Amino acid sequence: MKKIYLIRHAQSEYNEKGIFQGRLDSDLTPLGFVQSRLLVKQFEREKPEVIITSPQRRAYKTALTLSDVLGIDLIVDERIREMSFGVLEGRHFWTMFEENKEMIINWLKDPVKYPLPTQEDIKEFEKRIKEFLEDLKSRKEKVLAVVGHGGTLHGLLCLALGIGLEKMWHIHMDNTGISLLEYDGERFYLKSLNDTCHLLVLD
Amino acid sequence: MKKIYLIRHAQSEYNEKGIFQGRLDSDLTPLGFVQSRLLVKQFEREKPEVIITSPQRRAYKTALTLSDVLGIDLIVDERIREMSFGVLEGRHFWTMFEENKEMIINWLKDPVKYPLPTQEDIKEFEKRIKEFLEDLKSRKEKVLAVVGHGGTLHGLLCLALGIGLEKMWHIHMDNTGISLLEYDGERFYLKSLNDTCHLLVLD
């Protein structure tokens, strides 16, 4: 069938600082670059035939390490850029949770019914990732990698499995975490979520 | 937080041969025994305080290896023994698929709406799994491991996330694959699915 390896980008400066990022565009940390290089190991034997990446720098530079070390075509796709969080971007997340415990808890339980104030319209968000997924179904490659963001990669999984974006924060992906989604021409199968085997050497 | 490590049992003879098993009870292969031994590597920092296993031999023996090396109690719970598949137990799976493609495809797509002939009643199955999961919430341990079977572990995951047993064959776990579910007193978060990092050495 088709193998789709979803890969959350490596650690960015705002991730390290615990800051809600969204459309903000911080650089990879020195650790992020290390994580990206280690990620290569997971793909030397079975090389993806294409890497598709968010244009945001934390995602692009993760994808580029793979594209360059393994010699793989890289495509940028704006449809998997992170969800915008409007007036909450740039804020320390746990500071924001202490001041708005119920807002955050409701949003994590069901972000469709309880969106954050000024966040990207959830129906517009769903539309762009759904179109991206439809395009993935049609692609000709047998093995592809998608480097994206928490929101967009969790959303893609929720749609592929038909469980709805209500569930998008019921799952987790760490930086450079890999989740393998297989597609047989009709339906999807989740074979793994948040594999960080390649980072064990940093323990 | 409570950390609940779900662990699919190690490879049994029927798994290695591609034979539908269910309530049948084949022993671990030589590979299953090494997989059970490698599993300990995952619990080097975070040690479970208890291991809970299915009584079936492939599960019990996997769990006993872990409990012996870590030095912790092994409890046995009938409620996570595998779903019964009735008269189909003991049939070569791929042979059965070729002769009954539509029966198998429908069952994988929605096993609630399209149960297999003579399979365990899905409402009884759900009941025992849900009662097991409710006891898990009340346990006093902060970290524990559950060694089970595809059907019962996928089903626990589906119920914990609220996505329904219709999705139980939309996710996969390999032999000794680990999936970390966290419980915060109110709801669940899936942190990983089908982690086999401990088996990297065998590749």
Author numbering:
A (entry chain B), B (entry chain A): 1 to 203
The authors write:
The riboflavin biosynthetic pathway is well-studied with dedicated enzymes to perform complex chemical transformations, with the exception of an unknown phosphatase that catalyzes the dephosphorylation of ARAPDP, the product of RibD, to generate 5-amino-6-ribitylamino-pyrimidinedione (ARAPD), the substrate for lumazine synthase. Using an anaerobic activity-based screen, two phosphatases from Aquifex aeolicus were identified that dephosphorylate ARAPDP, but only one reconstitutes riboflavin production in a one-pot experiment with the other four enzymes of riboflavin biosynthesis. The structures of both enzymes were determined by X-ray crystallography to reveal the vastly different folds capable of performing the ARAPDP dephosphorylation chemistry.
The second enzyme, a histidine family phosphatase, only dephosphorylates ARAPDP in the one-pot experiment thus facilitating riboflavin formation. HFP, like all histidine family phosphatases, is composed of α/β/α sandwich where the central six stranded β-sheet has one antiparallel strand. HFP is a dimer in solution, as estimated by preparative gel filtration chromatography. The HFP active site, or “phosphate pocket,” contains four highly conserved residues characteristic of all histidine family phosphatases, R8, H9, R58, and H149, as determined by sequence and structure alignments. Water hydrolysis of the phospho-H9 is assisted by the proton donor, E82, resetting the active site for further turnover. There is significant density in the phosphate site that was modeled as sulfate derived from the crystallization conditions. Phe93, Trp107, and Trp169 form a hydrophobic the cavity that would enclose the pyrimidinedione of ARAPDP, similar to hydrophobic pocket generated by Val11, Val15, and Trp181 in RosC. The HFP identified in this study has the appropriate specificity against substrates of riboflavin biosynthesis to be a dedicated phosphatase for this pathway.
